């Protein structure tokens, strides 16, 4: 599913700039936008365990 979404988001990025070409950097941005790994910022809840 992530792979499909990565390709799709690269395609939508291409759709953005009146362009019909997808480039490596566009795929990179697609990866970043798809694989959003939200992480808890509560350092205390995170350090509870040594």
């Amino acid at each position: 599913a992530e792979v499909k979404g990565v390709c799709t988001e690269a395609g939508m990025y291409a759709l953005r700039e009146r362009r019909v070409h997808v480039t490596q950097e566009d795929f990179e941005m697609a990866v970043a936008k798809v694989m959003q790994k939200d992480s808890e910022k509560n350092m205390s809840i995170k350090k509870l365990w040594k």
Partner: protein, 233 residues
């Protein structure tokens, strides 16, 4: 979810999680904004002192208090718990001073306050202290900034923020923070990180700032804090 195992504090969960301490940390985060910055030659602590009215004499209960003339302490969470921890921190510092004729190193004071919190988070009829402490100190020649959490856990910080919007505070500090940030600029950074969290006008009287440098921890007076706020604005 793990529902049953949340009314006690002497019972683990299938995940292994003690729910009650996490709830306490939620109480902590649901508190006042406070920020801490470890400058190259000092530490700076600040905390919103907003009151619910002009009626409260906003000079009667402080929030950045000393524990010695090299160590100080600010908080986010509840206030009575804070007073208890400050009292016990002073008592531990003085006990250490008697036993060893040397002002308590900040690391050890933090460790012992953490041990106190551990004492209170380990019995069936003791409520974990809901408050998280930032401990500033000057030992040897290196400023120290520690955070003590209700869970009995103590950990160092280059700079942090805690309270209602700790995420925003910490991202702002991440943007604005560099190691060689001398104290006069660390004060501005702390006050700005309080601004980005402080509703209403940051008057000189509704903000408390305490600075810990070689000369010794000192809580800035209203005149000094007003000067700094005017300079920043």
């Amino acid at each position: 979810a793990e529902r049953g195992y949340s009314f006690s504090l002497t019972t683990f969960s299938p995940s292994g999680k003690l729910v009650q301490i996490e709830y306490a940390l939620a109480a902590v985060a649901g508190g006042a904004p406070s920020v801490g910055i470890k400058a190259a030659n000092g530490v700076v602590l600040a905390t919103e002192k907003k009151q619910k009215s002009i009626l409260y004499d906003e000079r009667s209960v402080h929030k950045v208090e000393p524990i010695t003339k090299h160590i100080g302490l600010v908080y986010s969470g509840m206030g009575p718990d804070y007073r208890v921890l400050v009292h016990r921190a002073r008592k531990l510092a003085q006990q250490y001073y008697l036993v060893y004729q040397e002002p308590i190193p900040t690391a050890q004071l933090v460790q012992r306050v953490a041990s106190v919190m551990q004492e209170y988070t380990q019995s069936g009829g003791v409520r974990p202290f809901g408050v998280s402490l930032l401990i500033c100190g000057w030992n040897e020649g290196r400023p120290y900034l520690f955070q003590s959490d209700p869970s009995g856990a103590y950990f160092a910080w280059k700079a942090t923020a805690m309270g209602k919007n700790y995420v925003n505070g910490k991202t702002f500090l991440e943007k604005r923070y560099n190691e060689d940030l001398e104290l006069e600029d660390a004060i501005h950074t702390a006050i700005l990180t309080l601004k980005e969290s402080f509703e209403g006008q940051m008057t000189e009287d509704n903000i408390e700032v305490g600075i810990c440098n070689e000369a010794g921890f000192r809580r800035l007076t209203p005149t000094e804090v007003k000067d700094y706020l005017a300079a920043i604005a």
